Amino acid sequence: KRKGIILAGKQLLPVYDKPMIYYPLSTLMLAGIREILIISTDTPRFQQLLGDGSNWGLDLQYAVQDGLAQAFLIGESFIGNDLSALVLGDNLYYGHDFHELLGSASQRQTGASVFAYHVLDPERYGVVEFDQGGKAISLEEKPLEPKSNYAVTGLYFYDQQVVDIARDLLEITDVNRAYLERGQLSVEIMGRGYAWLDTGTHDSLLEAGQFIATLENRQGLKVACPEEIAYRQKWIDAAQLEKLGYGQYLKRLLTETVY
Amino acid sequence: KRKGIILAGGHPATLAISKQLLPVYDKPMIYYPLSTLMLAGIREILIISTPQDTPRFQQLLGDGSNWGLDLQYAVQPSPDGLAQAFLIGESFIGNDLSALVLGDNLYYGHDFHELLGSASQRQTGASVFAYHVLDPERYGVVEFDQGGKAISLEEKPLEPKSNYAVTGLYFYDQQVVDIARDLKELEITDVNRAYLERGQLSVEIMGRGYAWLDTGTHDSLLEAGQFIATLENRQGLKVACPEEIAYRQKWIDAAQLEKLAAPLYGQYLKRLLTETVY
Amino acid sequence: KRKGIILAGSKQLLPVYDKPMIYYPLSTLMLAGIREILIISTPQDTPRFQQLLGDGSNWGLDLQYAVQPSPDGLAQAFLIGESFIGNDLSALVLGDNLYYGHDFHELLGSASQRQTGASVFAYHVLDPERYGVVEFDGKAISLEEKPLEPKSNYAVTGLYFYDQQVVDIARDLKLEITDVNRAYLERGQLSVEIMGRGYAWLDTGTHDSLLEAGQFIATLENRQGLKVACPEEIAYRQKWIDAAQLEKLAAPLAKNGYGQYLKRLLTETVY
Amino acid sequence: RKGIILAGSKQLLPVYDKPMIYYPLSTLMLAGIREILIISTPQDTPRFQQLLGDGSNWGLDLQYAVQGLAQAFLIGESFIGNDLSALVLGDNLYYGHDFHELLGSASQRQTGASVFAYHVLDPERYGVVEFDQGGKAISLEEKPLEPKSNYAVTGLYFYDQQVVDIARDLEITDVNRAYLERGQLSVEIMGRGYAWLDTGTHDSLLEAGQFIATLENRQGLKVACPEEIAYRQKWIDAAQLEKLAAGYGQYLKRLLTETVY
Numbered sequence A: 001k002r003k004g005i006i007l008a009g010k011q012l013l014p015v016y017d018k019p020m021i022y023y024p025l026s027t028l029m030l031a032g033i034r035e036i037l038i039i040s041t042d043t044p045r046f047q048q049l050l051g052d053g054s055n056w057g058l059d060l061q062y063a064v065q066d067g068l069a070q071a072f073l074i075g076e077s078f079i080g081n082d083l084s085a086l087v088l089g090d091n092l093y094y095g096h097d098f099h100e101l102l103g104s105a106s107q108r109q110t111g112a113s114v115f116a117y118h119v120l121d122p123e124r125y126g127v128v129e130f131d132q133g134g135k136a137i138s139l140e141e142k143p144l145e146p147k148s149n150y151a152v153t154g155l156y157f158y159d160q161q162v163v164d165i166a167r168d169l170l171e172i173t174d175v176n177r178a179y180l181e182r183g184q185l186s187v188e189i190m191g192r193g194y195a196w197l198d199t200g201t202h203d204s205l206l207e208a209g210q211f212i213a214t215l216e217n218r219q220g221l222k223v224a225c226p227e228e229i230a231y232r233q234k235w236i237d238a239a240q241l242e243k244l245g246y247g248q249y250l251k252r253l254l255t256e257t258v259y
Numbered sequence B: 001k002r003k004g005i006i007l008a009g010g011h012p013a014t015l016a017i018s019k020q021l022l023p024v025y026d027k028p029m030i031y032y033p034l035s036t037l038m039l040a041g042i043r044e045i046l047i048i049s050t051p052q053d054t055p056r057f058q059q060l061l062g063d064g065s066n067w068g069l070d071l072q073y074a075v076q077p078s079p080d081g082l083a084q085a086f087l088i089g090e091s092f093i094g095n096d097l098s099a100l101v102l103g104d105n106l107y108y109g110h111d112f113h114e115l116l117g118s119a120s121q122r123q124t125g126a127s128v129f130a131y132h133v134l135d136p137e138r139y140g141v142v143e144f145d146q147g148g149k150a151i152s153l154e155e156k157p158l159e160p161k162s163n164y165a166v167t168g169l170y171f172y173d174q175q176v177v178d179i180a181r182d183l184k185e186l187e188i189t190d191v192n193r194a195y196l197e198r199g200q201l202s203v204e205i206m207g208r209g210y211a212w213l214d215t216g217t218h219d220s221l222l223e224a225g226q227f228i229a230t231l232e233n234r235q236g237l238k239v240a241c242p243e244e245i246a247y248r249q250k251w252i253d254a255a256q257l258e259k260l261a262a263p264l265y266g267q268y269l270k271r272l273l274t275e276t277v278y
Numbered sequence C: 001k002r003k004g005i006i007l008a009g010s011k012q013l014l015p016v017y018d019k020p021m022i023y024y025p026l027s028t029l030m031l032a033g034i035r036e037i038l039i040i041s042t043p044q045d046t047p048r049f050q051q052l053l054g055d056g057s058n059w060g061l062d063l064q065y066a067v068q069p070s071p072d073g074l075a076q077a078f079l080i081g082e083s084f085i086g087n088d089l090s091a092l093v094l095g096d097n098l099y100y101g102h103d104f105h106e107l108l109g110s111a112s113q114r115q116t117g118a119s120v121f122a123y124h125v126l127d128p129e130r131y132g133v134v135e136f137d138g139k140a141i142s143l144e145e146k147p148l149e150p151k152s153n154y155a156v157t158g159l160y161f162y163d164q165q166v167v168d169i170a171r172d173l174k175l176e177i178t179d180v181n182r183a184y185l186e187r188g189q190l191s192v193e194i195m196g197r198g199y200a201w202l203d204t205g206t207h208d209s210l211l212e213a214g215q216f217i218a219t220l221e222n223r224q225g226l227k228v229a230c231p232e233e234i235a236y237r238q239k240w241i242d243a244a245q246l247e248k249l250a251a252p253l254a255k256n257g258y259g260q261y262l263k264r265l266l267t268e269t270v271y
Numbered sequence D: 001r002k003g004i005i006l007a008g009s010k011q012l013l014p015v016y017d018k019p020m021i022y023y024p025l026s027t028l029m030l031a032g033i034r035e036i037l038i039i040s041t042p043q044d045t046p047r048f049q050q051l052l053g054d055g056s057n058w059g060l061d062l063q064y065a066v067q068g069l070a071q072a073f074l075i076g077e078s079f080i081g082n083d084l085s086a087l088v089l090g091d092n093l094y095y096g097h098d099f100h101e102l103l104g105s106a107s108q109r110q111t112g113a114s115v116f117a118y119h120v121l122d123p124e125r126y127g128v129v130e131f132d133q134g135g136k137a138i139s140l141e142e143k144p145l146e147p148k149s150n151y152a153v154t155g156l157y158f159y160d161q162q163v164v165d166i167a168r169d170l171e172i173t174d175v176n177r178a179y180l181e182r183g184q185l186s187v188e189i190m191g192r193g194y195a196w197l198d199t200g201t202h203d204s205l206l207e208a209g210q211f212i213a214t215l216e217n218r219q220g221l222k223v224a225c226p227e228e229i230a231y232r233q234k235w236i237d238a239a240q241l242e243k244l245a246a247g248y249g250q251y252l253k254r255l256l257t258e259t260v261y
């Protein structure tokens, strides 16, 4: 059992054709996570949008929020004794093998898993330094002189240790460094063939919109449609999808094989 | 040995410069299919184009020895079909395995090196890629049975059997030249159907996680440009930079990259010498 | 008579969305009523423009061609085109500039109809250091070529209207267009008209701006069902070519959206 | 002249750097209108109230009412009273040189109605206006199957004291035809040099966003910033702009210390 947390501290704005929250929600769903806590300021508006999630075969809970690590304190009782995963509300991911990348991370039963991605702008993120042999040797939160161009993405997989590490503090980078110092941090490369886009500024929200529109209008498939992912995980049956351009798309999913 | 062919066929936007010489954002369109053949490990490449455009590719790309490639050039007298590439490049292909790419196609995704590697390493039959599109009527369409086996190909069908379009990327064994010779426009789809009829066609799915973009219209060239710019300005890495791929294949050494970087894109090539990229 | 010069120092043969970049500055000179135009470019690019545009008689224009041996400055255009200009009023446009807005015919008309001094356009930009910057007291008091500390955010556009003085001013320079314009300013014969924020003046000179310019034109054109800076349209509306000539020009492009567009111009009133 | 914005949520979505409602709001403000009624759904009316307030921060008087497009004159009948009126739709964006003067001219007629005709690829989606050989408007059709022209009537309407009673007796096109039938409809051409964009679909909202970003990042000026328009109309002084300003804040500060023509 692994439980999910989305921290939305903007995430109700659409990226092209659906609310921004649908991307991190879809990401946790693709990783096989069904029990998800949405932490925000906005909490009632997410409740109004997403409900308890039983329409999508999910169990959605809500909590209200001083730092990203604070999510483990707020969701401590939600996490209980289970493995956890944390996603940030303003990140979207796209690529081939993304189901498998998440699967591998979510299936480790010990330590923590994070993803390093080559960016132009590493100073804006957690930066991970590698030695000559490609081993992760240091983490720095928004460094003035980055040790590498490899930014840690807003996607984190944690074992039962995280709550107690967070308690002894609030930077997510300190949590991740505590695992690294114990030799229990897995840093997987997210290859340049994957797209990890910021949706956090006026410019990047626009770029992300154009990016999704180009893929979707080319393929005739949607990126990060939660009802599709639910259906393909077999968390909802054809009857439930039937009940649930977006409506037309869901109908098409019942009458087409997509590989 | 597998040998590569890039077919760059043929207003008023393109009256001063053929389509595959137009830039997609920051580099000439030909750099994408060129980079694709290079990523598949192909170094000996024939560029077929119009009598007018062949000299301009020669002027842009040279013999390719700067990038550790062997580039040759041939002309297509008139646009009498895509299969005509095997007739024109028959002597270039000889008795070797071959690969055909179309000049106006752009590919991007994780495991693309591995997808190409697998196809290029088969020593028999033909390998093509099926991609889910909104607009299947514009392409070769591949129909699948309940067990996911390919059962038919149709060139630009009025009523497509599926949404799975065959991409502009083709891997062929020694049979292709003789199959092409016996065809009666000469369609690549007829070549592929001849393999399918012999049970020697491998149709690999190119997953929705890969981007296969058209660069063939004013609208799609613009979309493709915005797509590459977004990735490149996010990553600080280039898509389909031939000098990078050459360097990473170890077809050129750091000394050769330095020389190529000096006169120029140039700043980017210099950065490649002083950074580990996984 | 006012004679036009397009300096394209290749970039101006690249398309902005649906037509070659040169069609924008060409259309701009045409909208200003200029029919006799000299296209100055490199020895390599001059033949390619000749191949694209011809003598221009298809569009009721008289196009001539000259070469710039090496890129020794923008003012060099008046030395190269000295004989082409002769004793006539002149206009200079740069090959990588795109203009769009309401009253652009009237803005150009007014400038082209002055029979004395020089007329330039000041446009509020985020990035003034990249251009000639004009300082105001609303009277223009100074010009600086790509200043490190700009006196204002008002950039001088790539669009210049000159009287018979320009050739002799250019002859005595040591070669910046800004020095030419300052020589007029020093004589109190420089007219600096504001190009309002309601007009779009876009750079097409980098990978990023060429893309932005492309998206900009596509959005207008697909919204309106009208083209921006289509030379055959402007020629037809100036009555430099008749319906018969437009029909002939449309026929061979019949295949595509551009031929179809020219045919539509014969059977529709557009205000 | 009193203004009505009908926003029938979509008009709270941003076009690049500001809420969509800021464009039609800025349009009424540029036309010199300070008293504006925002009509929306029972659900969205409170959200506009929360965003915009009574508008006194921007030297405006903003009122709110809840909800065909002609129904706006019935709902805002008491708001309009005996005054001239102007109606804008919540999902339309306008840009061009002389837009202050185009609006000024329309807003300054003291009789009949003024609308704007714009050449579009897609006339069937709008009110279509037909012209005779002499450029006179001879007919209006609401979303015709066979459009008589490519000239769409924009979401921008100027009305005299007659409109409430015409509406009482529900398509905006019928209201406009009633004026046309009385020979009291002025149809001004909005030239191709102006941009009139739809922000009503996923595709057009994206296009509109890219369009505004390109202009704004080129000029270092904002399109349809209400605080700027208020300041330039002298409805608020430098002191009030300073308070409101305390990238968008930085922009308002810049407006106090720069001459912009």
Ligand SMILES: CNCCCNc1c(N(C)S(=O)(=O)c2ccccc2)c(=O)[nH]c(=O)n1Cc1ccc(Br)cc1
Residues within 6 Å of the ligand: A023, A026, A027, A030, A093, A094, A095, A096, A097, A098, A099, A222, A223, A224, A225, A228, A229, A232, A233, A259, B207, B208, B209
């Ligand atoms: C062929 N396997 C790869 C799946 C394609 N991958 C899918 C993606 N991606 C393109 S993704 O993976 O990059 C992604 C997922 C969530 C958010 C953002 C991106 C998607 O958006 N939706 C979808 O249904 N699948 C198929 C799918 C989903 C779940 C199951 Br279970 C099975 C299929």
Ligand SMILES: CNCCCNc1c(N(C)S(=O)(=O)c2ccccc2)c(=O)[nH]c(=O)n1Cc1ccc(Br)cc1
Residues within 6 Å of the ligand: A191, A192, A193, B032, B035, B036, B039, B107, B108, B109, B110, B112, B113, B238, B239, B240, B241, B244, B245, B248, B249, B278
């Ligand atoms: C093995 N790392 C994953 C590959 C990343 N893949 C790379 C891509 N891609 C994003 S791609 O593969 O999608 C692609 C390649 C050619 C044309 C179009 C797309 C690219 O453009 N350039 C590059 O150098 N590589 C690394 C690379 C190249 C060659 C070698 Br050999 C090793 C690395």
Ligand SMILES: CNCCCNc1c(N(C)S(=O)(=O)c2ccccc2)c(=O)[nH]c(=O)n1Cc1ccc(Br)cc1
Residues within 6 Å of the ligand: C024, C027, C028, C031, C099, C100, C101, C102, C104, C105, C227, C228, C229, C230, C233, C234, C237, C238, C271, D191, D192, D193
């Ligand atoms: C009728 N006055 C409005 C002009 C609309 N203006 C036009 C523009 N503009 C949008 S523009 O003016 O901004 C412009 C012109 C050239 C290059 C770049 C922009 C245009 O591109 N094409 C066109 O035919 N006209 C009509 C037209 C042209 C010439 C004559 Br003569 C008559 C009509």
Ligand SMILES: CNCCCNc1c(N(C)S(=O)(=O)c2ccccc2)c(=O)[nH]c(=O)n1Cc1ccc(Br)cc1
Residues within 6 Å of the ligand: C196, C197, C198, D023, D026, D027, D030, D094, D095, D096, D097, D099, D100, D222, D223, D224, D225, D228, D229, D232, D233, D261
């Ligand atoms: C010559 N100046 C006319 C307007 C310039 N143009 C302005 C525009 N435009 C670009 S616009 O006019 O196309 C427009 C306005 C509102 C909504 C949509 C578009 C604008 O957005 N804001 C602004 O302050 N002005 C100056 C300004 C405004 C008010 C006064 Br009063 C004075 C100056």
Ligand SMILES: [Cl-]
Residues within 6 Å of the ligand: A126, A127, A139, A152, A172, A173, A174, A176
């Ligand atoms: Cl981190």
Ligand SMILES: [Cl-]
Residues within 6 Å of the ligand: A190, A191, A192, A193, A194, B109, B110, B111
């Ligand atoms: Cl990769």
Ligand SMILES: [Cl-]
Residues within 6 Å of the ligand: B140, B141, B153, B166, B188, B189, B192
């Ligand atoms: Cl095929």
Ligand SMILES: [Cl-]
Residues within 6 Å of the ligand: A095, A096, A097, B206, B207, B208, B209, B210
């Ligand atoms: Cl995939």
Ligand SMILES: [Cl-]
Residues within 6 Å of the ligand: C132, C133, C143, C156, C177, C178, C179, C181
């Ligand atoms: Cl100057």
Ligand SMILES: [Cl-]
Residues within 6 Å of the ligand: C195, C196, C197, C198, C199, D096, D097, D098
């Ligand atoms: Cl203006």
Ligand SMILES: [Cl-]
Residues within 6 Å of the ligand: D127, D128, D140, D153, D172, D173, D176
């Ligand atoms: Cl109407």
Ligand SMILES: [Cl-]
Residues within 6 Å of the ligand: C101, C102, C103, D191, D192, D193, D194
């Ligand atoms: Cl106009």
